[PDB]
Amino acid sequence: PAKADGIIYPTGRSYSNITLSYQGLFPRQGDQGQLYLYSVSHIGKLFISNYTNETNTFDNGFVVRIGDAANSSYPIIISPARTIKKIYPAFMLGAYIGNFTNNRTVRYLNHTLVILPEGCGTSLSVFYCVLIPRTQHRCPEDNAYSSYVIWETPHQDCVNRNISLNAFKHYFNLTQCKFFYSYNITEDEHAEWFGITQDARGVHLYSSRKGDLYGGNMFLFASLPIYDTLKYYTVIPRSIRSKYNSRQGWAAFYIYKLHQLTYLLDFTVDGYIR
């Protein structure tokens, strides 16, 4: 917390050059979180991890640290060098879970909140939809199914508007959708922060691209009207299809659970928390 890591800024008000005690949803000090990596495909087959077989619990929400080490050169995960860019997480949140016909991975029954980066990282698309599995060769209603992914081929793309969506439609049929929101993202390489929390007024999405871009303070930008209590989330495995000459690195991101904690926040004259 000495660098103000994962701090949700108070909404509807600001403070200047004071220190006050705040009780809210804050991450614990010294919490390592969970490592999630997005790698490059073999153009061969896709390369992912077992991020879908795990059962995560939403609780009060979480905060995502996106874009750390977005300028360092590390060996590639699939070829253990090259520069590393910033990748955006894709999420999949729901209140009720079930099982597929082959008892593999996690299925979300009823209405599912799906968050997908869109336009090769130039926009974010959020929708509540009921997704009905598809019956095909590798699609989740077959014995040859392993996991559901979304893929972006940077070659050949970017500008397709529905690339993440057509990747999602490959696995599911989107019916009964209450909403679809789109938020534009400027292309940068700064380290960002994102949060999701549910209140009695819906699902609130926080980001540091609204205000305090060069720091880490997160600001509210979306109040989604989902009133059923979210209980599980899964990180959708994302893979990038590029040539062997084009392989490039991608920054991992960390997910820290939020807790009802008391924090002492230091405000500057400009109003930021540092």
Binding site: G12, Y15, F219, G271
Partner: protein, 410 residues
């Protein structure tokens, strides 16, 4: 004999002491000029989802949350005929004449014959399995009847969950609704109930849901649970009857004026100021949650201060019946012959450059200043007499002062 407390500052002193006669001394006496209304362009809240379709039942209640919009409360109150309301920490007249940062409305089809089961401490089937009202924000519970000419379509009947349980070999395990959340038996009960004590069963989670039937009335009866919030968003939700015309602050700066700053109501003093805090949030607070600044539309930052009162003092002299008024720690420019003194502006004292010894001062005025009755009240300066100086002698011994003549002091 009577005294009008208002007319003069000495009266006020006499009324405070409750005596026609007060002694001599320096006492202290007790000491909305515009409007700064700033609001958004305007947006209408979407109340069509409740006023259009078939209302749902108690367990499957629909919720609308409104933020940054204006709503016609008179039209909504004209559409429905209220049977009974009961509010908590708020009153509906304040809902008519005020602004809130958010507004959460939960509505469902609910008969008025079961109005006691929705009460505050009720233990019926509705509170245990259908809906539990949340008392953490100012909230109201309204039961209203919709006339036949309304656009709403009446349902087949009234359904509610009688019990919702699960499990075997441990007995029944009752599942009870949470505070402001949906029931766990919602997926079984979405289809509704057609006969009394009809039971629906789910083989996957082993959950059982049982319902009850009430006959549909001639007019549709509906229940509302509203909730309001304060100081959450930069914008606000306001009724259209509470909206007033915009006024600027390029004048009236430095006076105690009332403000409606995007739904924030209060009174204070506005001054043009250097920009601090984050502009987007729009409202800069202090530790104690008082509005410190306001990042305005005009483009200017205005540091808000609560409007104050200038302290007053009375220098009363009983033998001469003369009084003076001290304006504490404020210059004479503001008061606008007044004389600027080290203890502030004072009217009623003349300045004659007269000095009074300590021990001659009967009306001390803060610092080394005095009011003397020499009838008129004169401003003096206290100065003590310096000690007798015995000059040293350059000679072998010293010079000493030995008393000749004496007296006895008790």
């Amino acid at each position: 004999r009577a005294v009008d407390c208002g007319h003069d500052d000495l009266a006020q002193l006499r009324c405070s002491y409750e005596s026609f006669d007060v002694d001599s001394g320096v006492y202290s006496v007790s000491s909305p000029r515009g409007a700064f209304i700033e609001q958004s362009s305007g947006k209408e809240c979407d109340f069509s989802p409740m006023l259009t379709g078939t209302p749902p039942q108690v367990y499957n209640f629909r919720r609308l949350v409104f933020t940054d919009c204006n709503y016609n409360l008179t039209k909504l109150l004209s559409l429905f005929q209220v049977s009974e309301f009961s509010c908590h920490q708020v009153c509906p007249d304040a809902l008519a004449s005020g602004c809130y940062s958010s507004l959460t409305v939960d509505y469902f089809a609910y008969p008025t014959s079961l109005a006691s089961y929705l009460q505050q401490g009720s233990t019926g089937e509705i509170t245990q399995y259908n809906y539990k009202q949340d008392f953490s924000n100012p909230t109201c519970r309204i039961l209203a009847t919709a006339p036949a000419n309304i656009t709403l379509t009446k349902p087949s009947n009234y359904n509610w969950l009688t019990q919702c349980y699960k499990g075997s070999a441990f007995g029944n395990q009752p599942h009870y609704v949470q505070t402001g959340q949906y029931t766990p038996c919602l997926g079984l009960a979405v289809q509704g109930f057609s006969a009394a004590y009809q039971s629906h069963r789910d083989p996957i989670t082993k959950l059982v849901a049982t319902g009850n039937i009430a006959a549909m009335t001639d007019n549709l009866q509906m229940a509302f649970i509203i909730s309001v919030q304060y100081g959450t968003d930069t914008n606000s939700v306001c009724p259209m009857q509470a909206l007033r015309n915009d006024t600027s602050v390029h004048d009236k700066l430095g006076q105690c004026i009332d403000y409606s700053l995007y739904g924030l109501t209060g009174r204070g003093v506005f001054q043009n100021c250097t920009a601090v805090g984050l502009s987007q949030q729009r409202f800069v607070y202090d530790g104690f949650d008082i509005l410190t600044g306001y990042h305005s539309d005009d483009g200017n930052y205005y540091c808000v201060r609560p409007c104050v009162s200038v302290p007053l003092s009375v220098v009363y002299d009983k033998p001469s019946n003369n009084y003076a008024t001290i304006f504490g720690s404020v210059a004479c420019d503001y008061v606008n012959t007044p004389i600027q003194t080290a203890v502030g502006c004072v009217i009623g004292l003349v300045n004659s450059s007269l000095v009074v010894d300590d021990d001659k001062c009967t009306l001390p005025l803060g610092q080394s200043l005095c009011a003397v009755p020499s009838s008129n009240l004169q401003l003096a300066v206290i100065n003590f007499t310096r000690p007798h100086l015995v000059e040293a002698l350059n000679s072998s011994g010293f010079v000493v002062q030995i008393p000749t003549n004496f007296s006895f002091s008790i």
